[PDB]
From a paper:
Recently, the 4.1 protein, ezrin, radixin and moesin (FERM)-domain–containing kindlin family of proteins has emerged as key players involved in integrin activation. Kindlins cooperate with talin to positively regulate integrin activation. Talin binds the membrane proximal NPxY motif, whereas kindlin binds the membrane distal NxxY motif. Here, we report the crystal structure of human full-length kindlin-3.
Unexpectedly, we observed 3 molecules of kindlin-3 forming a homotrimer in an asymmetric unit of the crystal with each protomer dovetailing the next. Kindlin-3 trimer adopts a triangular prism-like structure along the noncrystallographic 3-fold symmetry axis with the following dimensions: an outer-side length of approximately 110 Å, an inner cavity width of approximately 60 Å, and a height of approximately 90 Å. Each kindlin-3 monomer adopts a cloverleaf-like overall conformation. The F1 domain resides at the center of the kindlin-3 structure with the F1 loop wrapped around its α/β barrel and interacting with other domains. The crystal structure of kindlin-3 trimer also reveals that the additional α2PH helix in the PH domain of protomer A directly wedges into a cleft involving the 2 C-terminal helices (α1F3 and α2F3) and the β-sheet (β5F3-β7F3) in the F3 domain of protomer B, thereby forming extensive contacts. The residues Thr467, Ser468, Val470, Gln471, Ala475, and Ser478 in α2PH of protomer A interact with Ser595, Gln599, Trp600, Ser642, Thr643, Leu656, and Gln659 located in β5F3′ and its preceding loop, and α1F3′ of F3 domain in protomer B (the prime ′ refers to protomer B in the trimer), respectively. In addition, the C-terminus of α1PH and its subsequent loop in the PH domain pack against the 2 C-terminal helices and their connecting loop in the F3 domain of protomer B, through H-bonding (Gln443 in protomer A with main chain of Phe640 in protomer B) and salt bridge (Arg447 in A-Asp653 in B) interactions. In the kindlin-3 trimer, the F3-integrin-binding site in each protomer is occluded by the α2PH helix of the PH domain from the neighboring protomer, suggesting that trimer formation could inhibit kindlin-3 binding to integrin β cytoplasmic tails. Although kindlin-3 monomer binds, albeit weakly with the dissociation constant (Kd) of approximately 200 μM, with integrin β1 cytoplasmic tail, kindlin-3 trimer does not show any detectable binding. Therefore, we proposed that the triple mutations Q471A, A475F, and S478A (henceforth referred to as AFA) could disrupt the protomer–protomer interface in kindlin-3 trimer.
Residue numbers in the entry: 14 to 145, 173 to 307, 320 to 326, 350 to 484, 499 to 666
The structure:
């Protein structure tokens, strides 16, 4: 039982210095964690904490490996901190909100978790952008909803469009003005293949969430109010700032839509006040401590509500002695969600427990099944049972209200809806009728369908899709520009502006960027292979756009999720464990 071990230095503390523990070369990474929690004697929740190991540019998710396996010795510095650090996350609607993001996951997983928080479906089309208001929580599950279960006092407007700028600063803001001034934005993309710390992003940094791939999948005006609003608002701010130009009569339909959607963003009523129950309800649980617990989807469970108390099971023969939960509803907090034309009959109950409120979302089928349960839960929350005369006098109130069942249910705005070159060339008077004239076609549109057509008309523009990486090319001086564009990749004479070479993506054979020469090489069927080198923008985000767009457009048929992550990393090169 002889050891003769070495000593390691492990940091802590919002700053960077803590303490030193003693381990062998044979020590387990997970064992070093326990030795480092005892060596400080703090009262925290390290559930998310991990180690950093700067010198070799990566951490240790492998909790079990030997310390000699990573090659670590007493030499190189160690950092014990959290994996989730707060970030500023600038939105594409020119607002911002503070959230915690994963520095430990590779960026494509980090952005996916961010969009997952922000109700942004299909996160493969978005990415984080480098530098040139509510805090966070934890969810960790497939997908949950009431509006987006954000239940707190902070509900910021990222789903509703932002008011239009005053025409004062719409001209004072920086504009594109030419190519090679347009290629700067795409020089700030982060590599969505390495973690967030391999990119040099520290604790308080700012990050931008822009749409990266101009190939949008299943734009549903019902499923994604946040994904739609942010996309539309990225498009307008590429029109109002001349990042993508349109024609004189298209700015009119663009301006007419911005007015119509903004006019409707500026505008049932559950205004109400004050023996067993056995049914098959559909239950949705929420762990108070969800850091190590996922939840399944809406589970259909056999619920029993007796005298006050509620238990639920999965079958009647598995009752009553073997429940899944048992709640002291003698507490409080039942809030409803009823959409008679949508058949949503959901009740939220916040059950105060010593460990933490157990959040459960019950959902019934008919108005009559719903009226019985919510009346029982609203009186159980008041102490009384279903044996009160007011319980039947509360069920009456519900069904009486649930009788209506779906048969009958200007201000002269600015000229700031148009780009700056249309307000210096047009007086603010003769485009106002032309906006209102072209507005009559879209006045019959809903907020999401009118937003959708703004993106549909933005998709029709002749230069929709191009990303402009100005990089040198194969046999040419003058270092012309490239541009990406999902289904193509072109070449432009930088100053002339003409399109010299138009290579198609479908004729592209399998070639990838690699070398010491820092130059990309693509093969292109019929052995016509083009090569170019990075001029001042970058060389890996070009290979990320190419493989990225190739990942897109070849997804699942209708329900395009569950994408192969070992394939996305494959389309940006190199495999990892």
């Amino acid at each position: 039982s002889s050891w003769e071990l070495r000593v390691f230095v492990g940091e802590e503390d919002p700053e960077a210095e803590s303490v030193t523990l003693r381990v062998t070369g044979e020590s387990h990474i997970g064992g070093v964690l326990l030795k480092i929690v005892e060596q400080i004697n703090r009262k925290q929740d390290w559930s998310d904490h991990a180690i950093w190991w700067e010198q070799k540019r990566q951490w240790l998710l492998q909790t079990h490996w030997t310390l000699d396996k990573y090659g670590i010795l007493a030499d190189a510095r160690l950092f014990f901190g959290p994996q989730h650090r707060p970030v500023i996350l600038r939105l594409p609607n020119r607002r911002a909100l503070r959230l915690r993001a994963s520095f430990s996951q590779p960026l494509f997983q980090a952005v996916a978790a961010i969009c997952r928080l922000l109700s942004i479906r299909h996160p493969e089309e978005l990415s984080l952008l480098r530098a040139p208001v509510a805090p966070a929580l934890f969810r960790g599950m497939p997908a949950h909803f009431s509006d987006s279960a954000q239940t707190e006092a902070c509900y910021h407007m990222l789903s509703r469009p932002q008011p239009p700028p005053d025409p004062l600063l719409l001209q004072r803001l920086p504009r594109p003005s030419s190519l090679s001034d347009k290629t700067q934005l795409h020089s700030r993309w982060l590599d969505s293949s390495r973690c967030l710390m391999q990119q040099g992003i520290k604790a308080g940094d700012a990050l931008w969430l822009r749409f990266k791939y101009y190939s949008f999948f299943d734009l549903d005006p019902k499923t994604d109010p946040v994904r739609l609003t942010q996309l539309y608002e990225q498009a307008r701010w590429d029109l109002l700032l001349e990042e993508i130009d349109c024609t004189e009569e298209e700015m009119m339909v663009f301006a007419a839509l911005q007015y119509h959607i903004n006019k409707l963003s500026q505008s049932x009523x559950x205004x109400x006040x004050x023996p067993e129950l056995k049914d098959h309800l559909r239950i949705f649980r929420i762990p108070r401590r969800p850091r190590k617990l996922t939840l399944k989807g809406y589970r259909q469970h056999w619920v029993v509500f007796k005298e006050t108390t509620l238990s639920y099971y999965k079958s009647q023969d598995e009752a009553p002695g073997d429940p899944i939960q048992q709640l002291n509803l003698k507490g409080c907090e039942v809030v409803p969600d009823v959409n008679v034309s949508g058949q949503k009959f959901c009740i939220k109950l916040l059950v105060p427990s010593p460990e933490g409120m157990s959040e459960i979302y019950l959902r019934c089928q008919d108005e009559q099944q719903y009226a019985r349960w919510m009346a029982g839960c609203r009186l159980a929350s008041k102490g009384r049972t279903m044996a009160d005369s007011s319980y039947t006098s509360e069920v009456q109130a519900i069904l009486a209200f649930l009788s209506l069942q779906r048969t009958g249910s200007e201000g002269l705005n600015p000229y700031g809806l148009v780009a700056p070159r249309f307000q210096r060339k047009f007086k603010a008077k003769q485009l106002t009728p032309r906006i209102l004239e072209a507005h009559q076609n879209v006045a019959q549109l809903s907020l999401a369908e009118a937003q959708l057509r703004f993106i549909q008309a933005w998709q029709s523009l002749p230069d929709f899709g191009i990303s402009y990486v100005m990089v040198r090319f194969k046999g040419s001086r003058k270092d012309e520009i490239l541009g990406i564009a999902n289904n193509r990749l072109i070449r432009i004479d930088l100053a002339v502006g003409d399109v010299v070479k138009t290579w198609r993506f479908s004729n592209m054979r399998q070639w990838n960027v690699n070398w010491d020469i820092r130059q990309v090489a693509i093969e292109f069927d019929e052995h016509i292979n083009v090569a170019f080198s990075c001029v001042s923008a970058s060389c890996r985000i070009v290979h990320e756009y190419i493989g990225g767009y190739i990942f897109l457009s070849t997804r699942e048929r209708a329900r395009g999720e569950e994408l192969d992550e070992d394939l996305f990393l494959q389309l940006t090169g190199g495999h990892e464990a």
